[PDB]
Each structure stands twice: as C-alpha cells, then as structure tokens.
Design a protein around this ligand. Structure first.
Ligand SMILES: [Zn+2]
Ligand SMILES: [Zn+2]
Ligand SMILES: [Zn+2]
Ligand SMILES: [Zn+2]
Lengths: 214, 213, 213, 214
C-alpha cells in the first residue's frame, strides 16, 4: 500500500460505518474513560484491541521500543500518571512478545545507532540474570529475556513515585506482566501481578524464582 | 475485567486458528513495517482500522497528545529505529479532535506530573494566539489540535534523525493527519515533506492557509 | 594533563589543612545550600567566584546553554530536590554572552546529537524574529542569550514543581542573569518572580523592555 | 547572604580584577577549548576548579543529582556528545563524593517526591551489589555505594553510542572515575580508567573485584 491507498481505505471504511452502522460513532461519542492502560512494544505485531477483543477507546495505550518503563522516561511516566491519577484506570498491562526485534537487538548488539542507548536498559537485564539465562538452552534465551524484561518493567512501574503514591492513597490499581507469540497470538500471564507495595515485591521475587527453578 | 480479556483472547485465537490456520503463519513471515504511526495514547480509533492496514504493517508510538518533543529520547528512539533500521518509507503523525491532552493544555487544570508534558502544547497555543484569537472561541480547540500535529511534524523533520536520513538520500516522507470521532474520517493537514526544503515550505503554507480557512 | 590535576589536588589539600585546619571542618558542618544555580556547561567563570559564595552554598546544575526544558527530568529532578527537600530560597538561571551553545543554535552547523537539544534555542530565535530582526545583526546573538535565560526562567516558573511550591505558600524566588567574559559583571535581566502572577508580569515586561533598549 | 549581596560581591569582585589584574579577562577572552569534561554532583561540596586547581574555562561541566550517566538521559548524553565530538575533550571525569545526599536518599529511601524516580537508578546498584555491601560493616556501606555508583556511571558512559563511536573512530578519549571526602578534599582514584572498548570492560570487572576481595 501507499499513502493514497490508506486514505482511500479510510474514506471507504468511513463511508460504510456512517451509513451501515452509525451506532459505531455514537458509542465513541460517549465520554467513557478507558479502564486499562496498555504499555506495549512499537512492533505491535498484533494490535492490543484485537488481542483482547476490546472496543475502540476502551484502552489507553503507550508503545515504545521493547515496551520499557525506564525509571526516568518522562514520556511513559507521563502516560502512566495521566492514566492513574486522571483517568483512574483500574488495570495496567505491560505486554511483551516473543521474537521482539528490540530484545534481539539488545542481545546481538549490532551497531544500530541512537537506539542502542535505549536498548542498554535491556542489556542490563540480560546481565543481571546471566546465571538463569546461561543455565538454559541457547535457542530459549531470547524468549526468556523477553519475559524477564516485561517482569523488570512491571517492577519498575510499581516502584515509580506515581504508583507508590496511588497505592498509598489507597487507590485500586493492578499492574500485570503479559506476553504472547505470533504463532497463536495467545496471551501468557507471567504472574507478577501487583496490587500494592507488598504484593509487588513478593510477586516479583516469586515470578523470577519460578523461572530460576523451572 | 481482566479475566474477560484473557477469555476473549483464548476464544479469538482458537476461532482464527480454526477458520484461517494460516493467519498466524502470515504474521510469522517476518514483514518489516513500511509505516511509522505516531499517535495519541487516547487511541480513540485504532490506526489499523482507520487505515485498513493489517497487523505488523505499522510500527507504532503513542504518547499523550502525539508529541514529538525535540529532546524526548523515547519518541526519538522509535523514530531512529524505524528510519535507520526498519527503513520505513512513511511516518504519520496523527491527532484527533476532542483530544483530552489538547483540551487539558488549554483549560490548564492541575492534573499533576502530566502538566509538564502538556506545556509543549501550551507553547503552541500561545505561539498562534493571533490566528486563534481572530476565530470563534468554539473552533479554537480543534484548530489547536491541527496546529499541534503540524508543529510536531515540523519538529520531527528538524530532528537530527530526519535531517541526516534525508541528507544521505534516504526516501522518507512525513505526514500530518487528524480525524474526528463523529465519522472517523482522516483529514490530511497537508504538511507532507520529503526533504528539508519542502518541510519548511509546507509548514509555512500549512499555517498560512489555516489563516485563510 | 590528568597527573597534574591529582598533584594540584594533593598540594592544595595539604596547603589548606596546614594553613586552616578548620576549612574542611567548616564544610563538614552540613550546611544546606540556600541557592540553586542553573548555568551552562561552558562554565566560563565559576559561579562561586562570580557571586563570592563559598563551596557548598550553591546547589548546582549545568547543561549546554543553561536550558530548563519542560520535560527534561534531569534538570527537573535537581529543581524538585532543591525546592522540596533542600528548600532553597533562590533559583538563579544564568547565561553568558558568547555562549557556544547559543551560537551553535543560530549558525546551525551539523554537530550531531547535540543539535536536538539546541532546537529549543532555535525555537526562541524564531519566536522573537521581529524583535531580533529590527536590530543590528551584530547584537542579535547577545540578545538571544538574554531571551534564552528569560524563556528558561519562564519555563521554570511554569513547571509543576514551582507552581505547587508557590501554591502551598513556600518562599522561592527565581532570577534570570547573564554576564560577559570581558568583565565578568553580572547583569540582572529583571525577570525575578516570587509567584505565578509576577512570573507572567515580569516575562511580559522583560520582553517588552528589550523591544525598547 | 541574600540576592543583593551576591550582586554586590560580584560588582566589587569585578571592579577589582578589571583594574587590578585585567589579564584575567584577557585569558578568558581567548577561544581555548576545554580539555576536560567534569561530570559531578549538584551538591558541589567543593567546586571542581578548586579541587583540581584549574583556571576558569578549562573545564566543561555537567552536574546532576548524584552524578549519574543514565543510558537514556539526553541532558547528560548531549553534554557528553558536544564535549567529545565538538570540543574534542581528551579526558572525562565522573566524580562522586562520600556523604552525597543523593546516594543517601537512595538508600534510606524517604518519600521525597519526584526525585525518587531519578534515585531508583542508584537503588538498582545498591541491589546489584547486595552481596558486597552486605559483607561489610553497616557504617561503610554508603561510602561504598558512592564508589560503586561512580564506577557504574563510568561503565554506562563507556557503553554509550557516543563513546563507542569515538573509540571506534580512533579518537583519543579517556574516562575516569574519581571520588573525594569533605574532610580533606583529597581526590581518590577508583581506577576504572577506560581508553577504549577493551580496557573499559576489563578495568570495570577489575575495579569491582578489588572491592569484592579487599
Ligand atoms: Zn518488539
Ligand atoms: Zn488524545
Ligand atoms: Zn554556554
Ligand atoms: Zn551529592
């Protein structure tokens, strides 16, 4: 496709719904705040809406290379703060995916340019868990790192002043760490689910151990 | 709730695997996206559905109010990776009328940390105060939404990432669009640039023509 | 070279310990800085020497061209810590004429990554194009240096950190200064603000008076 | 002192040099590029110029809370890139100091607000070396972390695309990790000195081991 093609597809697409199912735009026209914040990868192999079967506007979304939650990235932190303190989302999902180009670039470490800086946050994880990854079959390491990464980001998110404050105020917010593959688009729960400053630390330590023992 | 999502995903997967056991094979066939879509976290209408693109055809970045801040490494990293590594041919910055981020910037309510990010939009509101001034107070937010996309397109074109990509002769086109929720119809703000010179020319006329419509 | 530095440090330390064995005790007496100095990495003349302040009396931040970007967490963290934790009474943003960062922004040479950071200064150059235009092309860089400090002061005052500090009644004053290398004499750009309202008023008159001098 | 006091001190200070030693401003008037980039802490207990006995303008400087070099902080990365690629500094010094309020806030972890996000990068180090720090007398841990921090930043700096590129191009640049105390203002070399992509990795591993064995 080319630009004129997308514009044509939209023109036709819109013309239908506006005559066929006008109700579609009526539902969107409703000021219904999203209940979920989806933090995923720019690769966007399978759109979050399609993966979860959710209607348009039910998901507040943020995407960056390799779905990271860097302690000091004000882009993601701002998305999170608006979602939590203003939209008051009930759930936050950090979703990674096996085969992610970002994660792979972090390991193979080619000289890609500017992006390698952002990817060093993933290499820190690669090293941090060098014992767990080394005690594994080579062709399983990238998929494992992919899970470790999501788990580390969930942890980072829980430690952010935004979440600590939300939880201290007693606000009900739950963060999840998910992952999926393009061979079945089936979501796998990495069970690092946190609902407060306590369950966050335990579920994290437990999430990691599981992989370390299984 | 959450449980529902995992269920929808389970069924959806099963259903597709049965109806089209190739659907996922198609995705498996590693296909590099040809487009980079920079939109708002509000994501009122998925980019895939607006453009009629299938999964994987779009590399995507979303932040509040679809900004391209000169010094935001998050967005810049997505752009550099898409341009230098994926070699996308097109970059689309798309805004949407009624955007909460845009409205929050004008009304200026005390929302917390997010207000710092929104100050970049307030800069635009004040930058175009005359143009917006001589205009019905009602149409101002929608115009600011358009001005914002146009300004972010301008920023994107001025980034060292785009300036060096164009300098080495790489073919990359950046676009500025916007759509409304009442019809989901995309509007080309006409600031499409293929190099440094047209970026300047399109921005100039882009703003100038608004002061005519 | 490096070796020289360690030697100078060795001797300097010895010499002080012998002349004033209390000098270091003085520093030891944990004293919270009352001022935050935001200057340029060029650091032509140390802040301590310009102001006649002794070590530890200044909490400091330096970046290229002394910017306070709305969304730069580096500078914002230094500001929040100094304001909410150290409780500094004054914040000074100081620029200097002949600044390489400021000049690089106007001349626009291809310097690499740093050009993205400098785009914030180019925004200011274009923002005040009329004022700078009706002016000798020779005095433009120096004026841009002043405009830049004034704009960064404005940004600092609009940050949620300063807005919430002032809202809770905390006493914090922000200043905008500049000095030249030919005399190291500080010039108050007169954009001193103690709250939200005066920040706006001082900025307005600050720019307006320049269009008079 | 108050604002009017600083302005007065400057007025008097300037009036002297301009009549006493006009040569001072003549030397500055010379377009002599700095040969060193100093990355230190905002605390600035003892000014870098005074610590090294260097004249004004001989040091390009950057300061942030706890002298960090975050993989993705474009503020510091931009200072570094300008210094290395434009000024062509020969040496880069990351200097920490014992007693640093930032490092201490990272450990004690009080609820300071926004700043705690930036400090999580130091807590990652605290945990990373939990074995080395735990096998130590409590009242020695903060000073140790202070060194570990500087060492980790030097490492981060060496891994940045800016340094990797400079070294690949064959440009001569050396990065050092220093530290000092306010009891004597004496600079201590943490010997993690890197001059290329090779010495960087070894000196790092060695720098850490030393503390781990001594
Ligand atoms: Zn990915
Ligand atoms: Zn929006
Ligand atoms: Zn400067
Ligand atoms: Zn410190």
């Amino acid at each position: 496709k080319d630009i004129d093609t997308l514009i044509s597809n939209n023109a036709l697409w819109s013309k239908m719904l506006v005559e066929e199912d006008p109700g579609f735009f009526e539902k969107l026209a409703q000021a219904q705040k999203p209940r979920f914040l989806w933090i995923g990868c720019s690769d966007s192999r399978v759109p979050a809406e399609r993966l979860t079967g959710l209607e348009p506007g039910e998901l507040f979304v943020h995407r960056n290379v390799a779905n990271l939650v860097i302690h000091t990235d004000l882009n993601c932190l701002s998305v999170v703060q608006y979602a939590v303190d203003v939209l008051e989302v009930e759930h936050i999902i950090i979703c990674g995916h096996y085969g992610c180009g970002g994660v792979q670039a972090a390991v193979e470490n080619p000289e890609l340019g500017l992006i390698n800086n952002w990817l060093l946050h993933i290499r820190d994880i690669w090293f941090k868990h060098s014992s767990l990854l080394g005690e594994m079959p080579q062709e399983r390491r990238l998929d494992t790192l992919c899970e470790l990464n999501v788990m580390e980001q969930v942890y980072n998110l829980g430690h952010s002043t935004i979440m600590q404050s939300a939880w201290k105020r007693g606000q009900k917010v739950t963060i999840h760490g998910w992952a999926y593959g393009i061979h079945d688009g089936l979501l796998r729960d990495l069970d690092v689910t946190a609902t407060n400053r306590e369950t966050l630390e335990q579920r994290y330590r437990h999430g990691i151990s599981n992989l370390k023992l299984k």
